[PDB]
Amino acid sequence: VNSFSGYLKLTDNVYIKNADIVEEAKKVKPTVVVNAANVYLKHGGGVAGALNKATNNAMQVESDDYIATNGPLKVGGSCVLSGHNLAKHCLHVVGPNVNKGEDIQLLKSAYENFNQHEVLLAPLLSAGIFGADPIHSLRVCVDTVRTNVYLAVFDKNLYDKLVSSFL
Numbered sequence: 001v002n003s004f005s006g007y008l009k010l011t012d013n014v015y016i017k018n019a020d021i022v023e024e025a026k027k028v029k030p031t032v033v034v035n036a037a038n039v040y041l042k043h044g045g046g047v048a049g050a051l052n053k054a055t056n057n058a059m060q061v062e063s064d065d066y067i068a069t070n071g072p073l074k075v076g077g078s079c080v081l082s083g084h085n086l087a088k089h090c091l092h093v094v095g096p097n098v099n100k101g102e103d104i105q106l107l108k109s110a111y112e113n114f115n116q117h118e119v120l121l122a123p124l125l126s127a128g129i130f131g132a133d134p135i136h137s138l139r140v141c142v143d144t145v146r147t148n149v150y151l152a153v154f155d156k157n158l159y160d161k162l163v164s165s166f167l
């Protein structure tokens with residue numbers, strides 16, 4: 001048993017809810033929240049800017065030190081950093097950004113990072129301002145992630161479409 005509430009079960013291991021991931025993280029304090037990161041860990045908008053804003057910019061300060069030491073992530077890669085006031089850990093995952101011309105095949109590689117964590121709260125990768133089709137992102141998630149993932153869908157309209165089109 002875990003603390004996640006109100007999710008619709010899609011598969012053995014994937015659950016979905018219409019929710020603000022920031023508000024959900026604050027309520028649950030999950031072991032792992034996933035950020036929709038870029039390779040520079042520049043958290044300006046969408047999930048990264050909303051998560052970062054909720055940490056009062058502490059996520060950005062920590063991220064800038066990580067990049068100064070390690071250099072940028074890979075598209076499809078990840079790093080584990082603090083979850084600050086939102087979670088124990090934040091798994092920063094870089095999905096391909098269609099609005100930068102990145103290979104959508106890298107979306108599967110991105111989701112494979114989730115398999116290193118038994119339970120995660122996460123947004124759809126490469127969705128929103130990263131420009132991918134969220135229906136596709138959900139399919140890749142279901143077909144790639146084997147650990148228990150609780151997906152927070154921001155748009156109620158999109159949530160309803162994801163549910164109603166799910167095979």
Ligand SMILES: O=C(O)Cc1n[nH]c(=O)c2ccccc12
Nearest residue numbers: 036046124127128129153154155
């Ligand atoms: O949650 C959603 O409704 C779609 C979605 N998935 N992932 C994102 O990163 C993102 C960012 C902004 C706006 C919507 C998104």
